Amino acid sequence: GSHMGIQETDPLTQLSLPPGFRFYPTDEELMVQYLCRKAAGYDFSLQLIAEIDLYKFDPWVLPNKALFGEKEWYFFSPRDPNRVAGSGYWKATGTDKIISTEGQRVGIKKALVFYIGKAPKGTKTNWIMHEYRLIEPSDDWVLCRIYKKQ
Amino acid sequence: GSHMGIQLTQLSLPPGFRFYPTDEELMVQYLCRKAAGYDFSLQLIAEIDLYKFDPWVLPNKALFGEKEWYFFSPRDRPNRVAGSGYWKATGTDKIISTEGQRVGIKKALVFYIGKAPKGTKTNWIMHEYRLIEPSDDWVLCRIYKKQ
Ligand SMILES: [Au+]
Ligand SMILES: [Au+]
Ligand SMILES: [Au+]
């Protein structure tokens, strides 16, 4: 009959963010305010960053799966070398960083780069992932920042 | 005499959100809206006479900010005195545009301590944004400390 459209929820508009405010979290904030508080069920933590299985997708599709973002995008992905995703694989790079809060260490940040193809014969892309994980024993998520270098 | 007292947190802001406006946003969403007499959900950028203060106490007056601070200051109708020093214009002024139309001018200044022209340079910087006008009267200033 009469038309009834779908009514999406933009999480930034429900926060009433004033113009000019952007999401530029520190590593400590990502660990404590997002990754840790997700486990505790805090509203903003659950509503601002989307859960996805990151390894089902090519990275250039990810910006469209993120709840927001201009040149970087954040996700929670299930916690689990050269892991396959879409048409390629993510390869760990650089030196992992320990993240601390109030003298205590809480998480580890790992950098990865996406290669297109089949390992170890893929070609490097500009797609970068920073994977943040809690230091804890064996729901279970990592928080990932995705961006394109340049 | 029973006691009768005088009465950012109101705002919901989740951790990680920081004020990083583009020049176009400062001109159109802040300075133009204020000049046109529009209301704001909350006042985040307060009015102050910037030239009454040494720049290093300005962070205490700003309603938010960790490393840059923003204010509306009365539009003035070289080396303007403020507190113990003066602000000296530097660099090349920039025209700011929105949708093919020029709307504002950004000017940089640097604070010197002392009496002009014999002061010494500090790391305190101001960016003064003003609306383009014919040849609520405010400028919008960003204050920060270099390094
Ligand atoms: Au936690
Ligand atoms: Au205006
Ligand atoms: Au305002």
GROMACS .gro file of C-alpha atoms and ligand atoms in nm:
model
  300
    1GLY     CA    1   0.000   0.000   0.000
    2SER     CA    2   0.139   0.334   0.116
    3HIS     CA    3   0.519   0.332   0.132
    4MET     CA    4   0.707   0.251   0.453
    5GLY     CA    5   1.081   0.308   0.425
    6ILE     CA    6   1.363   0.175   0.639
    7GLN     CA    7   1.481   0.412   0.912
    8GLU     CA    8   1.855   0.371   0.972
    9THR     CA    9   2.034   0.461   1.294
   10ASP     CA   10   2.335   0.690   1.261
   11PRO     CA   11   2.519   0.652   1.593
   12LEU     CA   12   2.690   0.996   1.563
   13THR     CA   13   2.359   1.185   1.528
   14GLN     CA   14   2.222   1.005   1.834
   15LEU     CA   15   2.527   1.142   2.024
   16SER     CA   16   2.455   1.500   1.905
   17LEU     CA   17   2.818   1.559   1.799
   18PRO     CA   18   2.880   1.930   1.735
   19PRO     CA   19   3.026   2.007   1.392
   20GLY     CA   20   3.405   1.972   1.392
   21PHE     CA   21   3.426   1.686   1.644
   22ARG     CA   22   3.598   1.378   1.503
   23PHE     CA   23   3.698   1.036   1.636
   24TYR     CA   24   4.075   1.050   1.699
   25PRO     CA   25   4.124   0.811   1.991
   26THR     CA   26   4.454   0.752   2.164
   27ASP     CA   27   4.579   0.392   2.192
   28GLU     CA   28   4.498   0.397   2.565
   29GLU     CA   29   4.140   0.506   2.487
   30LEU     CA   30   4.097   0.232   2.229
   31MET     CA   31   4.211  -0.030   2.482
   32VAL     CA   32   4.029   0.087   2.794
   33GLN     CA   33   3.727   0.285   2.669
   34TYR     CA   34   3.643   0.064   2.369
   35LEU     CA   35   3.791  -0.284   2.383
   36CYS     CA   36   3.769  -0.330   2.764
   37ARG     CA   37   3.434  -0.152   2.802
   38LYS     CA   38   3.282  -0.360   2.519
   39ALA     CA   39   3.330  -0.665   2.742
   40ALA     CA   40   3.153  -0.474   3.022
   41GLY     CA   41   2.867  -0.378   2.787
   42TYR     CA   42   2.900   0.001   2.783
   43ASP     CA   43   2.651   0.159   2.542
   44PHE     CA   44   2.889   0.391   2.349
   45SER     CA   45   3.145   0.111   2.311
   46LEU     CA   46   2.883  -0.124   2.160
   47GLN     CA   47   2.717   0.137   1.937
   48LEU     CA   48   3.007   0.329   1.786
   49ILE     CA   49   3.217   0.050   1.640
   50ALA     CA   50   3.070  -0.226   1.421
   51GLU     CA   51   3.130  -0.600   1.477
   52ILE     CA   52   3.239  -0.775   1.156
   53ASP     CA   53   3.446  -1.070   1.047
   54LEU     CA   54   3.721  -0.865   0.898
   55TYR     CA   55   3.879  -1.159   0.721
   56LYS     CA   56   3.579  -1.212   0.493
   57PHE     CA   57   3.648  -0.893   0.298
   58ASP     CA   58   3.891  -0.706   0.079
   59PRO     CA   59   4.001  -0.397   0.274
   60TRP     CA   60   3.870  -0.150   0.010
   61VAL     CA   61   3.517  -0.273   0.082
   62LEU     CA   62   3.556  -0.197   0.453
   63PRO     CA   63   3.487   0.180   0.453
   64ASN     CA   64   3.133   0.102   0.344
   65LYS     CA   65   3.093  -0.146   0.637
   66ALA     CA   66   3.210   0.108   0.904
   67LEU     CA   67   2.950   0.307   1.104
   68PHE     CA   68   3.146   0.624   1.020
   69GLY     CA   69   3.493   0.748   0.918
   70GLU     CA   70   3.661   0.990   0.678
   71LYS     CA   71   4.006   0.835   0.621
   72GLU     CA   72   4.029   0.559   0.887
   73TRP     CA   73   3.774   0.301   0.998
   74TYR     CA   74   3.730   0.097   1.317
   75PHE     CA   75   3.586  -0.251   1.376
   76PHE     CA   76   3.561  -0.525   1.634
   77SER     CA   77   3.655  -0.862   1.483
   78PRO     CA   78   3.661  -1.208   1.646
   79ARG     CA   79   3.982  -1.281   1.830
   80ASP     CA   80   4.159  -1.592   1.707
   81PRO     CA   81   5.065  -1.566   0.997
   82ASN     CA   82   4.967  -1.437   0.652
   83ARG     CA   83   4.595  -1.471   0.720
   84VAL     CA   84   4.375  -1.486   0.411
   85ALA     CA   85   4.110  -1.221   0.350
   86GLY     CA   86   3.918  -1.184   0.025
   87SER     CA   87   4.155  -1.174  -0.273
   88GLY     CA   88   4.466  -1.157  -0.056
   89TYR     CA   89   4.621  -1.181   0.286
   90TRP     CA   90   4.725  -0.972   0.586
   91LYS     CA   91   5.093  -0.984   0.680
   92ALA     CA   92   5.226  -0.866   1.017
   93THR     CA   93   5.485  -0.586   0.996
   94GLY     CA   94   5.701  -0.369   1.224
   95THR     CA   95   5.739  -0.390   1.599
   96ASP     CA   96   5.438  -0.468   1.822
   97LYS     CA   97   5.369  -0.201   2.087
   98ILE     CA   98   5.262  -0.257   2.449
   99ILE     CA   99   4.986  -0.023   2.557
  100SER     CA  100   4.970   0.079   2.921
  101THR     CA  101   4.728   0.263   3.147
  102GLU     CA  102   4.813   0.400   3.495
  103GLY     CA  103   5.135   0.200   3.520
  104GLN     CA  104   4.970  -0.129   3.412
  105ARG     CA  105   4.990  -0.295   3.077
  106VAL     CA  106   4.665  -0.372   2.920
  107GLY     CA  107   4.708  -0.437   2.548
  108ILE     CA  108   4.926  -0.499   2.243
  109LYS     CA  109   4.905  -0.316   1.911
  110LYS     CA  110   5.014  -0.502   1.598
  111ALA     CA  111   5.047  -0.354   1.250
  112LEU     CA  112   4.956  -0.549   0.937
  113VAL     CA  113   4.966  -0.477   0.562
  114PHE     CA  114   4.741  -0.629   0.299
  115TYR     CA  115   4.892  -0.814   0.002
  116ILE     CA  116   4.680  -0.911  -0.304
  117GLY     CA  117   4.731  -1.266  -0.427
  118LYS     CA  118   4.849  -1.590  -0.281
  119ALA     CA  119   5.126  -1.603  -0.023
  120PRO     CA  120   5.417  -1.573  -0.047
  121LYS     CA  121   5.372  -1.428  -0.397
  122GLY     CA  122   5.126  -1.145  -0.335
  123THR     CA  123   5.190  -0.777  -0.409
  124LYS     CA  124   5.190  -0.515  -0.134
  125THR     CA  125   4.901  -0.267  -0.118
  126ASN     CA  126   4.861   0.058   0.076
  127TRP     CA  127   4.591  -0.094   0.301
  128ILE     CA  128   4.704  -0.105   0.663
  129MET     CA  129   4.550  -0.257   0.972
  130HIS     CA  130   4.632  -0.186   1.337
  131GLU     CA  131   4.503  -0.473   1.552
  132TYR     CA  132   4.459  -0.401   1.924
  133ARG     CA  133   4.425  -0.691   2.164
  134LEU     CA  134   4.389  -0.722   2.540
  135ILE     CA  135   4.651  -0.898   2.741
  136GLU     CA  136   4.432  -1.170   2.885
  137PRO     CA  137   4.417  -1.551   2.907
  138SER     CA  138   4.239  -1.771   2.654
  139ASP     CA  139   3.287  -1.255   2.413
  140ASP     CA  140   3.633  -1.237   2.254
  141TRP     CA  141   3.724  -0.946   2.021
  142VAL     CA  142   4.011  -0.752   1.881
  143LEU     CA  143   3.967  -0.389   1.779
  144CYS     CA  144   4.108  -0.303   1.437
  145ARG     CA  145   4.178   0.031   1.271
  146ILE     CA  146   4.184   0.014   0.891
  147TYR     CA  147   4.328   0.287   0.666
  148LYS     CA  148   4.494   0.341   0.327
  149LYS     CA  149   4.850   0.484   0.334
  150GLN     CA  150   4.906   0.803   0.126
  151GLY     CA  151   2.146   3.460   5.599
  152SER     CA  152   2.056   3.113   5.471
  153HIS     CA  153   2.292   3.028   5.185
  154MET     CA  154   2.201   3.120   4.829
  155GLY     CA  155   2.474   3.027   4.585
  156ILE     CA  156   2.522   3.096   4.217
  157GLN     CA  157   2.497   2.792   3.985
  158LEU     CA  158   3.094   1.989   2.821
  159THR     CA  159   2.963   1.753   3.092
  160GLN     CA  160   2.603   1.820   2.978
  161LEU     CA  161   2.720   1.703   2.635
  162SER     CA  162   2.740   1.325   2.607
  163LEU     CA  163   3.083   1.304   2.448
  164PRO     CA  164   3.220   0.950   2.425
  165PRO     CA  165   3.596   0.913   2.473
  166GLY     CA  166   3.809   0.969   2.163
  167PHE     CA  167   3.608   1.254   2.009
  168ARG     CA  168   3.822   1.566   1.971
  169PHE     CA  169   3.754   1.906   1.816
  170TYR     CA  170   3.934   1.915   1.482
  171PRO     CA  171   3.732   2.153   1.261
  172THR     CA  172   3.818   2.240   0.903
  173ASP     CA  173   3.853   2.609   0.817
  174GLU     CA  174   3.527   2.590   0.624
  175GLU     CA  175   3.351   2.448   0.929
  176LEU     CA  176   3.484   2.724   1.155
  177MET     CA  177   3.362   2.988   0.908
  178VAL     CA  178   3.023   2.846   0.824
  179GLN     CA  179   2.918   2.636   1.123
  180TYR     CA  180   3.056   2.861   1.396
  181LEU     CA  181   3.131   3.218   1.294
  182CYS     CA  182   2.854   3.263   1.030
  183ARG     CA  183   2.589   3.090   1.245
  184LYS     CA  184   2.680   3.311   1.543
  185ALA     CA  185   2.675   3.629   1.331
  186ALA     CA  186   2.330   3.532   1.194
  187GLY     CA  187   2.192   3.506   1.550
  188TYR     CA  188   2.133   3.130   1.552
  189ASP     CA  189   2.116   2.940   1.881
  190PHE     CA  190   2.363   2.659   1.954
  191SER     CA  191   2.277   2.322   2.128
  192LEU     CA  192   2.553   2.408   2.372
  193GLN     CA  193   2.805   2.690   2.376
  194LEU     CA  194   3.142   2.525   2.322
  195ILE     CA  195   3.334   2.827   2.201
  196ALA     CA  196   3.300   3.105   2.456
  197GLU     CA  197   3.317   3.476   2.417
  198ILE     CA  198   3.617   3.650   2.572
  199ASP     CA  199   3.819   3.968   2.517
  200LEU     CA  200   4.131   3.791   2.411
  201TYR     CA  201   4.345   4.102   2.434
  202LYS     CA  202   4.297   4.126   2.813
  203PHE     CA  203   4.510   3.815   2.873
  204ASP     CA  204   4.852   3.660   2.841
  205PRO     CA  205   4.802   3.362   2.606
  206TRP     CA  206   4.924   3.105   2.864
  207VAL     CA  207   4.618   3.158   3.083
  208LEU     CA  208   4.376   3.117   2.794
  209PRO     CA  209   4.361   2.735   2.827
  210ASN     CA  210   4.199   2.786   3.170
  211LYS     CA  211   3.921   2.992   3.008
  212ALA     CA  212   3.842   2.751   2.719
  213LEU     CA  213   3.550   2.509   2.774
  214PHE     CA  214   3.744   2.223   2.609
  215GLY     CA  215   4.071   2.144   2.431
  216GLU     CA  216   4.395   1.966   2.518
  217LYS     CA  217   4.644   2.142   2.288
  218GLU     CA  218   4.439   2.400   2.092
  219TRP     CA  219   4.176   2.637   2.226
  220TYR     CA  220   3.900   2.837   2.058
  221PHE     CA  221   3.727   3.166   2.139
  222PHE     CA  222   3.504   3.434   1.999
  223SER     CA  223   3.659   3.778   2.057
  224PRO     CA  224   3.515   4.122   1.964
  225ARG     CA  225   3.601   4.223   1.610
  226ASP     CA  226   3.823   4.533   1.613
  227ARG     CA  227   3.674   4.842   1.449
  228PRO     CA  228   4.974   4.630   1.425
  229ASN     CA  229   5.131   4.469   1.735
  230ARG     CA  230   4.813   4.484   1.939
  231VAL     CA  231   4.888   4.479   2.311
  232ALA     CA  232   4.767   4.191   2.524
  233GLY     CA  233   4.869   4.143   2.886
  234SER     CA  234   5.247   4.160   2.920
  235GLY     CA  235   5.307   4.163   2.545
  236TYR     CA  236   5.172   4.199   2.196
  237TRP     CA  237   5.041   3.994   1.902
  238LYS     CA  238   5.231   4.037   1.575
  239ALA     CA  239   5.080   3.932   1.244
  240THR     CA  240   5.289   3.680   1.048
  241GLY     CA  241   5.278   3.484   0.724
  242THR     CA  242   5.034   3.504   0.437
  243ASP     CA  243   4.662   3.554   0.512
  244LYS     CA  244   4.442   3.279   0.360
  245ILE     CA  245   4.099   3.322   0.197
  246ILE     CA  246   3.849   3.056   0.305
  247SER     CA  247   3.576   2.948   0.064
  248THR     CA  248   3.259   2.745   0.071
  249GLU     CA  249   3.080   2.617  -0.243
  250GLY     CA  250   3.267   2.848  -0.480
  251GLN     CA  251   3.216   3.158  -0.264
  252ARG     CA  252   3.480   3.332  -0.045
  253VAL     CA  253   3.345   3.373   0.307
  254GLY     CA  254   3.637   3.440   0.543
  255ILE     CA  255   4.000   3.537   0.594
  256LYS     CA  256   4.246   3.352   0.825
  257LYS     CA  257   4.535   3.555   0.970
  258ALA     CA  258   4.824   3.414   1.177
  259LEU     CA  259   4.977   3.597   1.473
  260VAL     CA  260   5.261   3.531   1.718
  261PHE     CA  261   5.282   3.656   2.073
  262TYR     CA  262   5.586   3.860   2.182
  263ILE     CA  263   5.653   3.940   2.550
  264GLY     CA  264   5.753   4.299   2.619
  265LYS     CA  265   5.701   4.635   2.457
  266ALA     CA  266   5.702   4.667   2.077
  267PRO     CA  267   5.919   4.669   1.880
  268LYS     CA  268   6.159   4.523   2.141
  269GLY     CA  269   5.975   4.215   2.269
  270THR     CA  270   6.093   3.854   2.254
  271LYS     CA  271   5.914   3.584   2.050
  272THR     CA  272   5.716   3.313   2.227
  273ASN     CA  273   5.573   2.989   2.098
  274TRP     CA  274   5.213   3.114   2.145
  275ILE     CA  275   5.026   3.133   1.814
  276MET     CA  276   4.686   3.271   1.722
  277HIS     CA  277   4.482   3.201   1.408
  278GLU     CA  278   4.217   3.473   1.372
  279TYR     CA  279   3.923   3.393   1.143
  280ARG     CA  280   3.706   3.682   1.021
  281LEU     CA  281   3.408   3.712   0.786
  282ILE     CA  282   3.456   3.897   0.454
  283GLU     CA  283   3.248   4.216   0.461
  284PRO     CA  284   3.165   4.531   0.254
  285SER     CA  285   3.421   4.814   0.281
  286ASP     CA  286   2.713   4.023   1.686
  287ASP     CA  287   3.052   4.139   1.557
  288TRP     CA  288   3.311   3.870   1.632
  289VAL     CA  289   3.624   3.699   1.515
  290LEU     CA  290   3.689   3.335   1.598
  291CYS     CA  291   4.040   3.264   1.725
  292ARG     CA  292   4.236   2.943   1.766
  293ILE     CA  293   4.515   2.964   2.027
  294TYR     CA  294   4.797   2.708   2.056
  295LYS     CA  295   5.158   2.672   2.168
  296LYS     CA  296   5.407   2.564   1.899
  297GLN     CA  297   5.618   2.250   1.972
  298AU      AU  298   3.877  -0.460   3.002
  299AU      AU  299   2.669   3.505   0.848
  300AU      AU  300   2.868   2.892   2.008
   0.00000   0.00000   0.00000
